[PDB]
Symmetry: C3
C-alpha cells in the first residue's frame, strides 16, 4: 500500500517538474516565433511567407492538464 | 482496486494531453528552425554557419511512445 | 501485483522516452534563440530589442527529474 503510494507520489513529483519545464519551453518557442516574424518584417516579408509563422495557437491543454494533475495529487496523496 | 484504477486512468488521461502538447511544440520548433534558415539564406549564409541549424533530426520517439501509451491504456482500462 | 508492476514499468518506459524527447526539444529551442540573436546583431539590434531573446535560462529541472526517475525505476522494477 505504502509501496503503491510511494510509486504514485514519485510519479506526481516528477510530472510536476516536467509540466513546468514543458510550459517554459512552449513560452520560449512562442517568443522565438515572434522574433522571427519581426525579422521577416525587417526583410519586407509577412509571416504568411514562411510555413507556420503566423500561427501562435499551439496545443495548450494546460487547463485540463493542471486540473487532472491536482486531482491526481489529491487522489494519490490523501 | 478501483482506487488503483482511478490513479492509473488519471495518469493515462494526463499523459495523453501532455504527449499531444509535446508533439505540437516539436512541430513548431522545426518550423521555426526552417524560418531561421531562410533568413540566414537571405543574409548570404548557410545553415552550417550557426550551431545546429542544419539539423532537423530531433529526438522523436513518437512511434515507441504511442505504442507504449496504447498498451498502457489497454492494460489499465480493461 | 504483477499487473501493478506491469503498469508501473510501462509508465517508467514511456516517461524515459518522453524525457529524452523534451531534453532534445529544449536544446533545439536554445540553439534557435542563439541563431535569432545572431540575425538581430546582423540588423544592428541587440537581444534586448525583442521580448525574451536575451534569456537562455529556461526551466531546466533535469537534475531533480533524473534523480526522481532513477528512484522510480529502482522502486518499481526491484
Ligand atoms: Cl524555437
Amino acid at each position: 500500500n505504502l509501496y503503491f503510494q510511494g510509486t504514485a507520489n514519485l510519479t506526481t513529483s516528477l510530472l510536476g517538474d516536467l509540466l513546468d519545464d514543458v510550459t517554459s519551453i512552449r513560452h520560449a518557442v512562442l517568443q522565438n516565433r515572434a522574433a522571427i516574424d519581426f525579422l521577416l518584417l525587417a526583410h519586407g516579408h509577412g509571416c504568411e511567407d514562411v510555413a507556420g509563422m503566423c500561427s501562435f495557437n499551439l496545443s495548450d491543454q494546460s487547463e485540463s492538464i493542471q486540473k487532472k494533475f491536482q486531482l491526481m495529487k489529491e487522489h494519490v496523496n490523501k
